[PDB]
Amino acid sequence: VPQKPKVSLNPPWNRIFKGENVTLTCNGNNFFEVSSTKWFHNGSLSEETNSSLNIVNAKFEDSGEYKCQHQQVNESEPVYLEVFSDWLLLQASAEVVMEGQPLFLRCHGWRNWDVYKVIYYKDGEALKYWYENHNISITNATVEDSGTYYCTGKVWQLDYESEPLNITVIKAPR
Ligand SMILES: *[C@@H]1O[C@H](CO)[C@@H](O[C@@H]2O[C@H](CO)[C@@H](O[C@@H]3O[C@H](CO[C@H]4O[C@H](CO)[C@@H](O)[C@H](O)[C@@H]4O)[C@@H](O)[C@H](O)[C@@H]3O)[C@H](O)[C@H]2NC(C)=O)[C@H](O)[C@H]1NC(C)=O
Ligand SMILES: *[C@@H]1O[C@H](CO)[C@@H](O[C@@H]2O[C@H](CO)[C@@H](O)[C@H](O)[C@H]2NC(C)=O)[C@H](O[C@H]2O[C@H](C)[C@H](O)[C@H](O)[C@H]2O)[C@H]1NC(C)=O
Ligand SMILES: *[C@@H]1O[C@H](CO)[C@@H](O[C@@H]2O[C@H](CO)[C@@H](O)[C@H](O)[C@H]2NC(C)=O)[C@H](O)[C@H]1NC(C)=O
Ligand SMILES: *[C@@H]1O[C@H](CO)[C@@H](O)[C@H](O)[C@H]1NC(C)=O
Ligand SMILES: *[C@@H]1O[C@H](CO)[C@@H](O)[C@H](O)[C@H]1NC(C)=O
């Protein structure tokens, strides 16, 4: 059944600032041996053949759709990477999560700078409870956790607000 590679990102952040790094890794069931790989940036075949696709000092041109593919197996699901350039970027473990799975939010500051007085807003409303924590970690997700998020934080002496990010947790029917 698990008949297709699952692209994973390290760091998990599929949304990253211009110039940052990220490594795409193509992994699957060692059912059939894999000596090579096929990478696809915006549908075009990359020259990279190692199971790990690296992105150094991400450019905006690096944004897009990434997907790998091994021999004898279907094409991996797509993974969208998007390079930004702003003071605050709201990163997420996954923009879409199956109910029950972990959901991880983060208010990443430009050039890794530390962010103070961080507040997260879910649907224009301020997630007070989370005020204590720097970032938001939710072990077991809920369909109620769905909504448009965005953070607000002081970076190097000035206040800023990140671009909103819609996040949906799906209720699984079987
Ligand atoms: C792969 O497919 C992707 C589509 O899914 C392509 O992504 C687009 O790539 C272009 C550049 O190649 C990006 O454009 C740049 O955007 C920045 C950011 O602008 C921001 O700020 C202005 C004003 O301050 C605002 O008006 C904008 O809305 C942004 O908030 C500009 O500064 C650059 O000059 C340039 O226009 C696209 O943003 C990007 N789209 C996404 C969704 O990331 C990608 O290029 C494709 N690459 C290949 C190799 O096929
Ligand atoms: C790709 O994923 C599809 C499902 O969309 C798998 O299709 C099955 O393929 C077999 C013949 O290979 C066919 O008789 C079944 O009816 C298909 N099932 C469905 C639901 O359409 C396919 O996996 C299958 O084929 C490969 C070649 C291995 O033998 C797998 O063990 C087997 O499950 C997937 N293709 C590949 C190349 O993995
Ligand atoms: C992204 O990765 C590149 C690759 O290592 C980093 O560039 C290095 O920068 C250091 C300074 O910290 C230099 O000493 C090295 O020579 C650089 N290596 C290369 C290959 O250019 C870059 O700084 C990384 N950026 C982040 C945010 O991780
Ligand atoms: C709650 O989270 C743990 C993982 O730390 C997991 O074992 C458990 O199944 C989760 N609950 C649901 C409904 O998935
Ligand atoms: C963000 O959420 C709003 C309302 O839920 C929706 O209208 C908008 O299309 C979403 N953005 C994207 C890219 O789907």
Q: Could you tell me the CATH number of the domain that includes residue 151?
A: 2.60.40.10
Closest atom, ligand 2, to C-alpha of 3: 38
Return the closest-CA partner of residue 153 out of 111, 118, 129, 128. Answer: 118
Whether 8 and 77 have beta carbons less than 8 Å apart is answered as: no
Question: Which of 61, 84, 107 represents a domain boundary (last residue)?
Answer: 84
The number of residues making up the chain comes to 174
Type of residue found at 108: H
This structure's resolution (Å) is: 3.2
Decide the pairing of beta strands 116-122 and 125-126. Answer: antiparallel
Residues 6+ apart with CB under 8 A from 121: 127, 149, 150, 151, 152
Residue to probe by mutation, ligand 1, list 14, 55, 63, most atoms within 8 Å of CB: 63
Identity of the amino acid at 60: F
**Cross-strand pairs, 167:** 147
- Counting atoms of ligand 3 from 1, which one is nearest the CA of 111? 27
For residues 95 and 66, membership in a common domain is answered with: no
Give the residues across from 170 on adjacent strands: 98
Contact 69, 75 (CB under 8 A): yes
State whether 157 and 78 are in the same domain: no
Rounded Cα–Cα distance for residues 47 and 41 (Å): 10
Residue nearest atom 38 of ligand 1, based on CA coordinates:
60
End-to-end CA distance of the chain: 16
The domain in which residue 68 lies consists of 4-84
Tokens of 3: 């008949």
Contacts of residue 47, Cβ cutoff 8 Å, sequence gap at least 6: none
In 3D, which of 48, 83, 46, 87 has the Cα closest to residue 63?
A: 83
Strand-pair category, 165-170 with 147-154:
antiparallel
Q: Which atom of ligand 3 is nearest to the CA of 20?
A: 27
Task: Look up tokens 């990010």; give the residue.
Answer: 165
Same domain, residue pair 25 and 91? no
Q: From which experimental method does this structure derive?
A: X-ray
Could you tell me if the CB of 42 is within 6 A of ligand 2? no
d(CA 1, CA 86): 42
114 Cβ neighbours under 8 A, 6+ residues apart: 155
User: Does residue 139 line the site of ligand 4, with CB under 6 A?
Assistant: yes
Tell which residue, 148, 18, 146, 22, has the closest CA to residue 89.
Answer: 18
What is the tally of structural domains in the chain?
2
Q: State the Cα–Cα distance between residues 174 and 156, nearest whole angstrom.
A: 49
